[model samples]
Target: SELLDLVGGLGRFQVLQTMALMVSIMWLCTQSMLENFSAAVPSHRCWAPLLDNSTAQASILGSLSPEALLAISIPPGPNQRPHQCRRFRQPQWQLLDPNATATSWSEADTEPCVDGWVYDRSIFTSTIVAKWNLVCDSHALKPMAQSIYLAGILVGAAACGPASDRFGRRLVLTWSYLQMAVMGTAAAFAPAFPVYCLFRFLLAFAVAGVMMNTGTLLMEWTAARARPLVMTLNSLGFSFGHGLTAAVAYGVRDWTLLQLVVSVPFFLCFLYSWWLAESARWLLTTGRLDWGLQELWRVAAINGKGAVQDTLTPEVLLSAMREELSASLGTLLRMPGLRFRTCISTLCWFAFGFTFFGLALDLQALGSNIFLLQMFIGVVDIPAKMGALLLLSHLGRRPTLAASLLLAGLCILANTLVPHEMGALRSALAVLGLGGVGAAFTCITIYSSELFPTVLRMTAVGLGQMAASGGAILGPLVRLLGVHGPWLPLLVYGTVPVLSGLAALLLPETQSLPLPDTIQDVQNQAVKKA
Candidate 1:
């Protein structure tokens, strides 16, 4: 609060800083949506040899129209659709035989796509799948790449939290921002799928660092009264960036170009980051009163709050610094009450990530214009954040958290129940489920921050983030289960959140309480209630 007062609390300086941090949220959106473009597996089929090689180029089959060649080369499957993975070992020239009927030959005579595959280039000109032919037998590689990227996020979550505490927020953040830019650009020019996946995995580490640091910096700087608005704006920027990716993808229509488009903006962030300020709270807490006071005075001067100079003297700043406690892993888990809260918070975060990212990544499978659907999903996030704000204020933290998770779970289940032929209703339910999960994501982030003592807050939050990242890693892998049964993945996605919501009931409420400062603070609160 003293730090907020010196920075003119929500005035010109704080507002500018908040907006600057919000840009990182937008960049994080690009990372989240980048794979949606790069790894997209558009409709593809066996590349019939009819048009390839010198022999086929001048043959009678080549003389036929594409549709005519497909009719002779491709076999119909059980659904009476062209077999995507198999084609005739030899072009069934007997199709020209009017005497030949459906019983003339068997599909067992067909062979796999030995000649490579053809992709529908209307939505995307090139993707990882199209470039590497990650279809048929190697189809698992695409989702494996996505899983690897999410795994990088989990690693980053563990790395960034402690690193930020050690190295100072702005320093680590700038380096991560620059590193992410370099890796993302390098990925665009990668020659092979393995190389691209490696760069993307490394990029996720930098991205996670940027996201965690920016959020921490923003939350630390903003006044408590103004924190909700800062959070809302930050989330709005992220959602808007998500929708904007679809527009970028629509116009670009080429995976490599789209990667460049999203990757270039981070360089600008890295450049102008010279002006970015360190968190005075972090500096002061870390025993750097001189540096912390200098930054705060600069903030006050910039915001024209000259009156703050007299009140925030070296004496006052140094005295306040003595109260700061360094957080530790031992401090977080040594207490029973804190341990229970940690487990519950971690579970809520995991379930939220599973459902939220699961639905986002599954957009292409919805049989709609994926670009339009993605944009719609992005738009709903605004209302989700706003609704979460209202619900949290009215219903308090635990009820709001539980209800939002339960609502998201129910919506996902409802989506599975709607018949596939009712495409409109199904899409609507999906977007609604996305919205519900988005709201729960917002609710839980705030709730988790308040649930822990200030000293161990970031540590506890980092564990929650790691759990969420683990869930996100599994999110795409579960989509693979769609091959077994279309509803299986959705069933798992729907079930986790409802179970998490039930788990939320076990945690105590922190709506109107001051943030705890020690493990003992948490235990004392539980005893008071008992």
Candidate 2:
């Protein structure tokens, strides 16, 4: 009610989103900090050796630590020795080669264990020669990993959303979940940083697919009144994942064990393989007339209604899905309004990612110790997620989206302007900026999905997600570019969102309007002028 002094409240939610955005952004910042470095060393023991090494032997240990020197000093076992380019050589074991008669496969000098020929520790060990001490450019390597993951995300979002329209949401979701499990497991055991990066990228790719399919599944199942509420719940699930990561970090204690803990969820998600329904829309589109009828009936039966068999038809569904996809993808470049929304929203997502990723990576810069700072950040997400849930329903998409972006931008800008002497004020601004960005990040997803047709809805969301991933890829690099504080990237982050919020004012108010099912419908709708 106090907002009425200058401006009327948008209901009870006006001030609430501002708070929600702050909390959520803070939490996201926290979880990201933990996720980036938690694997490096959970225990202080990892870095203790660096502090304990001898002073002499500068020749043998000048650049190398005790552990690194020890590693180079040890002679290879009977089966192994250091080979060219420091590659480990293993004793050759004879195996039947397909072209054994024509050539000696060994003569080409393939890597050890090409086909059960040799055993090498390099096949499954970290790049770190010592337990706790980091290799050269250790800080630089993690953002590189984050970048690889983001690139995979971009590819996955671009492809999976479109594919889900052609295929079924259930199949896409199930496949994505399974791939996440496989890739995540592989990442945990990756032999080196480069391999780990490949696995991380693939895992992110699958994650985009899972999220895209999830929106498709949820949107198809709910009534309009309940859509935003259901989506907010899903956002809660994401927060739960972040919070769960923190809890797992505490429980597992070991980096590998933490990965195992994180991986268990993907396996569990797949266990519902038989239970989740295939997208009725997709079933009809693919010429599965009978299955579509059967599936719709199944959902109707669960809701205490009879068979929807009579209403279901393959031709209708195929036409609907195809039309939607064509409108979205086909005229995407040609339509002025559609293209404007896509490009503007996409830029905002990109900006969000660049700052968000950089902020998370530079957690150590926030304070002296990164680990505690990360843990604290993880704990912050729970409240932020909850706050978004309460505000999004009543405030509606536009205000929540625009206001959050503005708030996030301001928080980041505050960090850029103030000197360190601001003390508590600076810390408060940092927390506010992190939380605001977090809220804005999720709000962008919720808002974008609601604006598109059901047929191409998830794909549009995926496209925007890919745009965000592009930003994420740049985030780490932006941090690397600056030798000083992370404020340069922060300036970019703060300004872009404000610009996005300004552009948001140009979008029609979508509250109370049913989503259009095609590009033509979207442009023609009365609410487009709201």
lDDT of 1 by residue, 1-530 (tens): 55676465657766787777787677778767878667666666777666455678676643677776777878776577777888786778888778889777875888888878878876666777787888877777766777888888888778777777778778988999898999999999998878888998899899878877777777777776666667767778778878888788788877788888888988898898878888777676556566777887877777778888666668765566566542666767777777888999999999988887766654555657878877877887788888877877778878988888888888877877878788778777777777787778778767776676545666777788899998888776676667898768878978998899999988786656655655556666778889
Task: After the best TM-score superposition of candidate 2, give how far the Cα of residue 500 lies from its true spot, in angstroms.
Answer: 1.6
Residue pairs with colliding backbones in model 1 are none
Off by over 4 Å in 2: 1-35, 38-134, 137-139, 281-289, 306-330, 358-375, 484-487, 526-530
The weakest ten consecutive residues by lDDT in model 1 span: 317-326
Q: How does candidate 2 fare on TM-score?
A: 0.71
Top candidate when judged by lDDT against the true structure: 1
**RMSD in Å for all candidates:** 2.9, 13.8
State how far residue 329 of model 1 sits from its true place (Å).
2.9
- Cα lDDT, model 1, residue 238: 78
Q: Tell me the tens digit of each residue's lDDT in model 2 across 1-530.
A: 11111112222322233233233332332234335544352211111122333443432333545444333322233345322122223222232224334233333443332111112223223223233233333545555555666788799889887887766788887788788888888887777767777887787777777667766665555555655666665565555545555555555555676666667655765774546666654554345556766776775555444334455366765665565456257656566766777777787777677667655543445675444565566567556756765677778777877887778777767767878677667777767766776677667777787766665666667778888888777665665677567556667666777787787777767777755655457766745475
Reference-based lDDT, each prediction: 0.77, 0.59
RMSD of 2: 13.8
